[PDB]
């Protein structure tokens, strides 16, 4: 997941400029709001949803936390629970016959 | 945007009748007992106050209730002139009625209240009062701008507290 | 900045109509129409006519037989707002009728257009 | 100036019809309808019988027999801001009814003139 | 087109009654509490007050509320002619019902209140008073005339400011 | 806790439109029917297509043109208490009518979806 | 323009005759149909009568007698948008059945010509 | 896509016929009827000539006489949504009934050709 | 359970036929007449194809000449409940009239299997 987040943000966004989600940035223009970065997310998760690896989504779309710096600048604070998919290992089954 | 409203309101009366009356001026509150014996009439003149806004069709728009408190003098319980006050009023609601002023539109004649008691009557003054509503909207959202160089993206993924600690901090246009 | 229409002006041949409230409008297109069968297709499409209907007071400078020989007139409907329609050989639909000081007209077109 | 209707009287045979409220008349003329097919092409004509419709205090010294026997009557529906019609040979409509004092008649004629 | 309208209710009952009334007056007010102290009745009277203007059909007419006091005089708790102040007060109505009074029209025949309590009943008069709703219509719009001699039109192409000037100084009716 | 739906906002092609009161969001599915015979015995499906009542301002931002335009927009219903839907390919039914600075839009839409 | 045949108006030697909300014309012709084979060898022609079908309210100045007694006359198909056709020497066929105050009437002769 | 056709253009010598309510078509080809014996035994081919039908309002530029004298035209289908089919060599058949305001009238040829 | 059916899909070759309200389906096999003389003496047989009524949205995807050109096709009558009848080398029979916006068409085979 570190990996292709990675290489994500180093592709998709280099030398852009991040700015307040109200900002009035035009379509072209390279700007990247907390929300535009908050919805590439999530459509990245889904992209790394459809194969697995994530499980839920709903918990993660109210988890995630993406944020200005207030302090300093030129840094966006995410904060997304990991909601990593388990894998099938034990299977426990009660049979209580009714006979 | 209710001063903006306000503003254009007064200049239309100002426009419409320039020297006929003595002075325009908003009032603050609405017409109490006590007014009379209070303001600066100096009639000739009609006051402009805000009577409040009514829930409007939408959750941007009200209704917004105007009054125009015209004022005049009865001396010897003769109005000081008759033809005079009545064409004020008639003129200051077909100049103020359907015409847009600033964002408000629709400026929709309510009543014309008689308003004119003992209080005004032994005070020498003929109170006859307008009412209107319009539809006016509500402010925008506050527009914001601002440009910083997107360098760093620090990614924190929430395990316990406890548990070891993971995070990418990325560091967006680094080269090698 | 985001004004709303208040009042709405009704013209005939660059004149004005004293209406009162509720002069409704509708434009000249196709009435999109749902297409159900086994599942949901699309929609279907039907011409339609422009039409103004506006209340008038009777007995006015207007006239009643002057708006019942109503045949070919250029109707505006003029948002106050600043947007405003104009009807192309427009004609007096319906019954009229002096009711109380009271017609209503409906003005109908073949197309609006949104002029100025 | 700019007068506007006011109240509206109803005479028959040049004799006042006590009208309370809201009397209601309406031309004879075209009823001007859409025809609507591939696209809207214009309009269709249909002809329509002028009509006055009061309504007249019951007990009074009309009448109600005489209302009813009314075959062939000169209806004149006057505005009260000046303009007036005529109904040439007009009739009863309608069915005619005494209920609670009052009485509604629908006063129906080929065509109406802008006497006066 | 109020004042004309008054003027023209005054008229008709000046008209229609002749000597029978003592007087008429506009009434500056509503009748208040203290009016039957304050004005010259000179009983029997009928005082025409305008009571205001609620909203008319359209933009440019309103329905006009006006108001007929009559006046006599009840010596001894008995009226002085009840047959008279009665014909008064019927005849009142029938003269001014339906008939137009300059620009209004359709005078109707609203409400008609006793309106007699202690404070005129002590003060030996009755006060029998009438309700009127007329559609009165908005004065127009004031006209213009003028005629100038056409001879010069000046355009300026609104460029920016410091930009060197574009403009054409027509100068029309210029033969050469 | 236990949050109700408060109000409903209605966006086109991601922009909201002002929706005064009680805007209507039918989702698209089947709707069951009763089939009654000799004795009762089921339910009958019928394909529903997803539509969408709004109520917009007359003369706004939004105009008439652009509204009476539009044959395929992504519409938007989102309950302010969370759950929101999308309407794939929506089309404007209905007649649209500018009645004293109101319009009705009926956005009716093959499918709807409830995303986030 | 805007003329969209409503209301055609029937005339016999200069009467007019009062016609009902329905009438109809076929103008003399060629009735083509099909002559078709193993291809479908284009088509057959077939001589055809004009004729005019329309209802009249009974007790009118015409009358019943004259109508069954109507041998050779000349009549008028005149359109409210102008369209005027002619036939001339016209006969009444059919059985001229009175029912319900209506006179159902067909007239028809050999030849049609559109004149104006 | 969702551009269910609900509306056609009749077209003769680029004349965009005014066409009512009720437009049907039928492409040339071949009927198949059944041919069963003791077994079901396949299907029988047919002739089939290519019919349009359309009412046309009266009173329009065409007429009713320039209908009943077309032998020779080139006639023209066409969908709102795209489907375009061309006639060539067409007739009129049947009986041009001119009842109402009405045009009843059906276009026959010999060969439908699907064009763009 | 519950699922009594009111909605069915056609299908062609895999394409879902896009059908309207009225879908009608009567499978191959034995249609039992009567030959009765004195007494009722049973039934006699009479052999039946197989048949699929359906009414298509004209403009879609399937369009009207690879109707009218459909002589060898594998056909799917789905119901919604579950049962799916297939017949195999079908054709389509009578006029494909395009009436309306409609396309009436009938399919028709020699064989119904039941499949699943």
Redo the contacts between chains.
Sequence with gaps: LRYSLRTRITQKFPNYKLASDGTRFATGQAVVTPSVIKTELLALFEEWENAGLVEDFDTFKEELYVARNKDDKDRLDVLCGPNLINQFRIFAAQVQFIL | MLEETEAALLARVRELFGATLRQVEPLTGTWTNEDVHRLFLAPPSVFLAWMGCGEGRTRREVESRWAFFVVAELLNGEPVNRPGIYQIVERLIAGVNGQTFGPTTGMRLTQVRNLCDDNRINAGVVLYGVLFSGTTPLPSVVDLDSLDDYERHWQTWKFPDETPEFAAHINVNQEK | ????????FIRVNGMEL????????????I???????????????????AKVEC?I?????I???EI??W??ITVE?Q?????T?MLA?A????????????ISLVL?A??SK?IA
């Design positions: 900045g985001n004004q709303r229409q208040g009042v709405a004293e209406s009162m409230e509720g002069a409704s409008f509708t434009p000249s297109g009435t999109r129409e749902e297409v159900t069968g086994s599942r949901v297709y699309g929609w279907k499409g039907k011409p339609r006519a209340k007071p009777g007995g006015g400078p006239g009643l037989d019942i020989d045949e070919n409907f948002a106050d707002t600043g947007e329609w050989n004609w007096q639909a319906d019954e009229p009728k002096n009711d109380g000081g009271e109908m073949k197309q949104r």
